């Protein structure tokens, strides 16, 4: 009824969500040339800026994950923007995909943080200058937070895109139900829809960047 | 039904929890105003943090709405 | 099997064997979690 | 209340130290001239 | 509207000029100063000082200590004890002095000379970071 | 010279003098040394004044006297209520630095 | 009916969530006052951020009212 | 009647939302006090913003009371 | 009766809205403390604004209590 | 009885409103700490205002508890 | 029983009011951090006020818990 | 059923408690903005604390959601 | 049963009270960020207070959860 835009799309009985997930990278052409067209120029510029702004903080071991993280911040971003197209199915609105993006990443990061550096890894569970009478619970709280963080990532992205698209759709329905009534009110609701669309573009970009930044900071912590 | 009724009540309740995100964004953007009024040369950089700050405040707010719908429709 | 392993498996190997091992372990954990979920349904 | 003031210094000393640090980190092209223009000859009696 | 007067014991960089914004590294934090700023007076710590002219160009000096004062009439007087333009310095000497001072710190034990050493370290750290 | 001229009739009313001034053109290092010595003297002056020879022209000079306030003076001055981020520590540092500045200025004049 | 009753209750509840936007705009404009009192030369620019700050605070508030009406009429 | 009862309950609930305006005006006038204590020469101008700040805080508060009466009488 | 019951419930609810006035006066007098600690020469004048600030915070609080009694007795 | 039940519910609700006084005293004494750390020479005088500030925050809190007991016993 | 049920509900409600004490201690110790970072020579003295500040914040919190138990057991 | 109904009500209630985390992250990132605007040379280090601060605020928020689901599904 | 139902409701309610601890830790770590950005030489010492501050905020939060479980299992 209302969640028609989030049901796994199928066409002619075929699960066409796979094509929608595969499509974004088709919008990033590459080239072995030296001077190239405008699209690849700007896109290489953006990848350069993003890599610089993200990886810089990491040490020599962290930056090996660079290829990963940048790719991440691209994929998500493109997907999000492709969502804002009419009648489009946004695969980030699915909890499944975000779980599969988060649990492996944060997982492996905590894994490598435990394999080596195990001493300080178990010591990060305790801040530096903690007095004695409050030691035990300060461990368990960190345990819960760490052991849940991937859930936070996945849901924060999933439901955010969900609510964005759902609200845009509801205000659209409202404008529809105000088409046959006061035209100035129809224009006011339309303008609110325009502002919300702009905000949704911004929230797309920002949610991509924030998912990336959070995973990156976890990596930094466990390196 | 009493079930449907309690779904409505719990939905409104879980919705209450968005006041936290409201005040959080209020604080974040107020601090951004102050910090920019102090050291305007850093405006760009400051703005970044602001967005991030915002991006986590709304985060918690989202969870509230989540349960809301996850009670209103999924349950 | 040719130009596939040449244009796919060639570049990725240093990542697929050393950089992404913990990633593979996490993938296994995520798959087991998803299987447990799909079971209890 | 900075740390050195807790230690018993004075901003004159802070300024001397900082000016000296900037004068030493000066390139040898300008170092001798800048040090000359800030050398202290006065003597307490 | 802003009448700026940047000076050193031996040199006058600006005088009664009209800039748009000057950024100073006050001992109680960095802050910017534009026209009609709230009247204040502060002492400096070693740091950059970027002066923005009306046209938009920026002059980046480095001051080791001194005093900034902005008054009711938007008249700013910035006196700096040693005001060097950033080119007259180098990273290697700064880093070496930083190492020497850190070593003396981890060697020293008395509060007076320890504080002196830490001040030197602060100056050198500000140096290295401010350069590049 | 001034110390030798004033020492006889005024010896008790005396804290510190200085030499080596006059041979070399004075520089801020000298003024900083003097300010150091004046602060590290165990004498908190509530007010003070410096007296020099304001140079007017190659033929004319006027003996002038500049005032020198203390921390409590500028602090308690009600007109200092409009100055911002002000506390006793910042005012103390600024007071000391202005003392050195005015000594340097008097020397160069 | 119990359904209509719960609609009213959930409407009032979801309405509670506007206190967050209230406090948020309060904070934003208070910070704007302070930041302008400090660095008045930037007034214009500062004001911009304020509006934006406001524009997001009311944002969250809107969502609350949304559910309100989206329960009062659409459901 | 259960309808009248729920009208009373929803009225009290929607009334709760005035706490946001209360805290908002509190913050605004507190910030005005601080900003004036720091740069009193701007008092007049500052006061203007304050009123405006207030004028939007009460704004949101009004909406709450609105639903209140718009439930108590219009419904 | 269910009516009397809902009157009690709505009274407690509308009473909740006094927390806003509580926090508002808290903020106002805290800011007054700071502003006086910074520019004590203006104490008298500052105090004036404080009272006014207070006089509006309690204002909103009053409205809450209003509905409270205006439900408890008038209805 | 349903009346006694609603008395308990409304009592808990009206009790909720003490969070405002809690945060208010928190803010007041925090500001007192800051203002004293700035201008300690005024400590005595500052403390006075603090008490007064406190004396009004608890004030509003009291009202909440008032209704509480004025529902629990008087009604 | 409906009485026991309402006792549980009112207990949870009156418990809500501890959020005020939570935020109050948060503010107090944050202000203590700032005030000490400014004027560390006064640390000892400052700490005193902090405790006192804390001692009143928890105060209000206590009242909440009071009603809680004073409903859970005494009633 | 009355059990399912109360599960929904308690879920919404326990969800309310996320407003605390919302305001907490708001405050943390606002303070980060200010502290960076004051001493930008420490940006990196400051950011660390911010995350940690955030990491505990969300912490408490989590507990709320915990009970929520631990009532919605486990009970 | 109505008893089990009210246990769930009261559990969610008492859980709401963790928002206070959430905001409290938010404030504490925000103030720690600011205080360190001001006087970084005191970092170590400052951090100590922070932990202590945190150690009391979570304290109150604990009490909430306490009643929660002390209702969910012990009663």
Curated annotation (Swiss-Prot), chain A:
Transmembrane segments: 3-23, 65-85, 94-114, 135-155, 161-181, 186-206
Gene Ontology terms: cellular component: mitochondrial inner membrane; mitochondrion; proton-transporting ATP synthase complex
InterPro entries in the record: ATP_synth_F0_asu, ATP_synth_F0_asu_AS, ATP_synth_F0_asu_bact/mt, F0_ATP_A_sf
Membrane topology designation: Multi-pass membrane protein
GO biological process, one term: proton motive force-driven ATP synthesis
Record note on what altering residue 153 to R does: In NARP and LS
SUPFAM superfamilies reported in the protein's UniProt record: F1F0 ATP synthase subunit A (SSF81336)
Keywords: ATP synthesis, Cardiomyopathy, CF(0), Disease variant, Hydrogen ion transport, Ion transport, Leber hereditary optic neuropathy, Leigh syndrome, Membrane, Mitochondrion, Mitochondrion inner membrane, Neuropathy, Primary mitochondrial disease, Retinitis pigmentosa, Transmembrane, Transmembrane helix, Transport
Keyword presence, Amino-acid biosynthesis: no
Major place of residence: mitochondrion
The keyword Cell inner membrane belongs to this UniProt entry's keyword annotation: no
GO MF terms held by the record: proton channel activity
Catalytic activity: H(+)(in) = H(+)(out)
Impact reported for residue 153 to P: In LS, MC5DM1 and APAO
Cellular compartment(s): Mitochondrion inner membrane
Pfam families the UniProt entry points to: ATP-synt_A
Record family assignment: Belongs to the ATPase A chain family.
Subunit structure: Component of the ATP synthase complex composed at least of ATP5F1A/subunit alpha, ATP5F1B/subunit beta, ATP5MC1/subunit c (homooctomer), MT-ATP6/subunit a, MT-ATP8/subunit 8, ATP5ME/subunit e, ATP5MF/subunit f, ATP5MG/subunit g, ATP5MK/subunit k, ATP5MJ/subunit j, ATP5F1C/subunit gamma, ATP5F1D/subunit delta, ATP5F1E/subunit epsilon, ATP5PF/subunit F6, ATP5PB/subunit b, ATP5PD/subunit d, ATP5PO/subunit OSCP.
Protein name: ATP synthase F(0) complex subunit a
Name of the gene this protein is made from: MT-ATP6
Curated annotation (Swiss-Prot), chains B, G, H, I, J, K, L, M:
Residue spans crossing the bilayer: 16-36, 51-71
Subcellular location: Mitochondrion membrane
Predominant subcellular localization, coarse grouping: mitochondrion
Membrane topology: Multi-pass membrane protein
GO terms under biological process: proton motive force-driven ATP synthesis; proton transmembrane transport
UniProt keyword terms in alphabetical order: CF(0), Hydrogen ion transport, Ion transport, Lipid-binding, Membrane, Methylation, Mitochondrion, Transit peptide, Transmembrane, Transmembrane helix, Transport
Subunit structure: Homooctamer; the c-ring consists of eight c subunits forming a circle, and each subunit adopts a hairpin shape. Component of the ATP synthase complex composed at least of ATP5F1A/subunit alpha, ATP5F1B/subunit beta, ATP5MC1/subunit c (homooctomer), MT-ATP6/subunit a, MT-ATP8/subunit 8, ATP5ME/subunit e, ATP5MF/subunit f, ATP5MG/subunit g, ATP5MK/subunit k, ATP5MJ/subunit j, ATP5F1C/subunit gamma, ATP5F1D/subunit delta, ATP5F1E/subunit epsilon, ATP5PF/subunit F6, ATP5PB/subunit b, ATP5PD/subunit d, ATP5PO/subunit OSCP.
Other information: There are three genes which encode the mitochondrial ATP synthase proteolipid and they specify precursors with different import sequences but identical mature proteins. Is the major protein stored in the storage bodies of animals or humans affected with ceroid lipofuscinosis (Batten disease).
Protein name according to UniProt: ATP synthase F(0) complex subunit C1, mitochondrial
Upper lineage: Eukaryota, Metazoa, Chordata, Craniata, Vertebrata
Residue span relative to the full protein: 62 to 136 of 136
Swiss-Prot record, chain E:
GO cellular component: mitochondrial inner membrane; mitochondrial matrix; mitochondrion; proton-transporting ATP synthase complex
N6-acetyllysine: modified positions: 100, 129
Keyword tRNA-binding included in the entry's annotation: no
Residues recorded as bearing N6-succinyllysine in the entry: 100, 129
Gene Ontology terms describing biological process: aerobic respiration; mitochondrial proton-transporting ATP synthase complex assembly; proton motive force-driven ATP synthesis; proton motive force-driven mitochondrial ATP synthesis; response to copper ion
Gene Ontology MF terms: proton-transporting ATP synthase activity, rotational mechanism; structural molecule activity
Effect upon mutating residue 70 to G: In MC5DN5; no effect on protein abundance; decreased mitochondrial proton-transporting ATP synthase complex assembly; decreased aerobic respiration in patient cells homozygous for the mutation; partial loss of function confirmed by complementation assays
Result for mutant: residue 46 to L: In MC5DN5; no effect on protein abundance; decreased mitochondrial proton-transporting ATP synthase complex assembly; decreased aerobic respiration in patient cells homozygous for the mutation; partial loss of function confirmed by complementation assays
Keyword annotations of the record: Acetylation, ATP synthesis, CF(1), Disease variant, Hydrogen ion transport, Ion transport, Membrane, Mitochondrion, Mitochondrion inner membrane, Primary mitochondrial disease, Transit peptide, Transport
Compartments reported by the entry: Mitochondrion; Mitochondrion inner membrane
Family of the protein in this entry: Belongs to the ATPase epsilon chain family.
Species of the source: Homo sapiens (Human)
Gene field: ATP5F1D
UniProtKB/Swiss-Prot annotation, chain F:
Binding partners and assembly: Component of the ATP synthase complex composed at least of ATP5F1A/subunit alpha, ATP5F1B/subunit beta, ATP5MC1/subunit c (homooctomer), MT-ATP6/subunit a, MT-ATP8/subunit 8, ATP5ME/subunit e, ATP5MF/subunit f, ATP5MG/subunit g, ATP5MK/subunit k, ATP5MJ/subunit j, ATP5F1C/subunit gamma, ATP5F1D/subunit delta, ATP5F1E/subunit epsilon, ATP5PF/subunit F6, ATP5PB/subunit b, ATP5PD/subunit d, ATP5PO/subunit OSCP.
Residue list for modification N6-acetyllysine: 19, 62
Modified residues (N6-succinyllysine): 19
Localization terms from the record: Mitochondrion inner membrane
Biological function: Subunit gamma, of the mitochondrial membrane ATP synthase complex (F(1)F(0) ATP synthase or Complex V) that produces ATP from ADP in the presence of a proton gradient across the membrane which is generated by electron transport complexes of the respiratory chain. ATP synthase complex consist of a soluble F(1) head domain - the catalytic core - and a membrane F(1) domain - the membrane proton channel. These two domains are linked by a central stalk rotating inside the F(1) region and a stationary peripheral stalk.
Chain positions found as Phosphoserine: 11
Protein known as: ATP synthase F(1) complex subunit gamma, mitochondrial
Gene name of the encoded protein: ATP5F1C
Family listed: Belongs to the ATPase gamma chain family.
Originating species: Homo sapiens (Human)
């Amino acid at each position: 009824n209302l969640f028609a835009s989030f049901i796994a799309p199928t066409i002619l009985g075929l699960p066409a969500a796979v094509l929608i997930i595969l499509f974004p990278p088709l919008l990033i052409p590459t080239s072995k040339y030296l001077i190239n067209n405008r699209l690849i120029t700007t896109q290489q510029w953006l990848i350069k800026l993003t890599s610089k702004q993200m990886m810089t903080m990491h040490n020599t071991k962290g930056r090996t994950w660079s290829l990963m993280l940048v790719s991440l911040i691209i994929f998500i971003a493109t997907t999000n923007l492709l969502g804002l197209l009419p009648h489009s199915f946004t695969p980030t609105t699915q909890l499944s995909m975000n779980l599969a993006m988060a649990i492996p990443l944060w997982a492996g990061t905590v894994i490598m943080g435990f394999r080596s550096k195990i001493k300080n890894a178990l010591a990060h569970f305790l801040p530096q200058g903690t007095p004695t009478p409050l030691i035990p619970m300060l461990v368990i709280i960190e345990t819960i937070s760490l052991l849940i963080q991937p859930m936070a990532l996945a849901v924060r992205l999933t439901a955010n895109i969900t609510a964005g698209h759902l609200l845009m759709h509801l205000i659209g329905s409202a404008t529809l139900a105000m088409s046959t009534i006061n035209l100035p009110s129809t224009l006011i609701i339309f303008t609110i829809l325009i502002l919300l669309t702009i905000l949704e573009i911004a929230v797309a970009l920002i949610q991509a960047y924030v998912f990336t930044l959070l995973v990156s900071l976890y990596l930094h912590d466990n390196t | 039904d009493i079930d449907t009724a309690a779904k409505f009540i719990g939905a409104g309740a879980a919705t209450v929890g968005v006041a936290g995100s409201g005040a959080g964004i209020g604080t974040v953007f107020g601090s951004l105003i102050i910090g920019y009024a102090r050291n305007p040369s850093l405006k760009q950089q400051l703005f970044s943090y602001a967005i991030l700050g915002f991006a986590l405040s709304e985060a918690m707010g989202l969870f509230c709405l989540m349960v809301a719908f996850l009670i209103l429709f999924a349950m | 099997l040719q130009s596939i392993i040449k244009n796919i498996w060639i570049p990725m190997k240093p990542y697929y064997t050393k950089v992404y091992q913990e990633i593979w372990i996490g993938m296994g954990l995520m798959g087991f979690i998803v299987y447990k979920i799909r079971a209890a349904d | 209340v900075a740390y050195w003031r807790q230690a018993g210094l004075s901003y004159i000393r802070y300024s001397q130290i900082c000016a000296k640090a900037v004068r030493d980190a000066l390139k040898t092209e300008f170092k001798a001239n800048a040090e000359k223009t800030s050398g202290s000859n006065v003597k307490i009696v | 509207q802003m009448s700026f007067t940047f000076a050193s014991p031996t040199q006058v960089f600006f005088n009664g000029a009209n800039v748009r914004q000057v950024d100073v590294p006050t001992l109680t934090g960095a802050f910017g100063i534009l026209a009609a700023h709230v009247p204040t007076l502060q002492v400096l710590r070693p740091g950059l000082v970027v002066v923005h002219a009306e046209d938009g160009t920026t002059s980046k000096y480095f001051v080791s200590s001194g005093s900034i004062a902005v008054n009711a009439d938007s008249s700013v007087q910035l006196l700096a004890e040693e005001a060097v333009t950033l080119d007259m310095l180098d990273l290697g000497a700064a880093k070496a002095n930083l190492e020497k001072a850190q070593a003396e710190l981890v060697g020293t034990a008395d509060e007076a000379t320890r504080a002196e050493i830490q001040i030197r370290i602060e100056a050198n750290e500000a140096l290295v970071k401010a350069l590049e | 010279k001034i110390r030798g001229i004033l020492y006889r009739t005024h010896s008790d009313q005396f804290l510190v003098a200085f030499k080596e001034v006059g041979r070399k053109p004075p520089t801020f290092g000298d003024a900083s040394v003097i300010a150091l010595e004046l602060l590290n003297s165990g004498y908190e002056f509530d007010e003070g004044s410096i007296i020099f020879n304001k140079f007017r022209s190659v033929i004319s000079y006027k003996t002038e006297e500049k005032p020198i306030f203390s921390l409590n003076t500028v602090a308690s001055a009600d007109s200092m209520s409009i100055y911002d981020d002000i506390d006793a520590d910042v005012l103390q540092n600024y007071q000391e630095y202005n003392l050195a500045n005015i000594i340097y200025y008097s020397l160069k004049e």
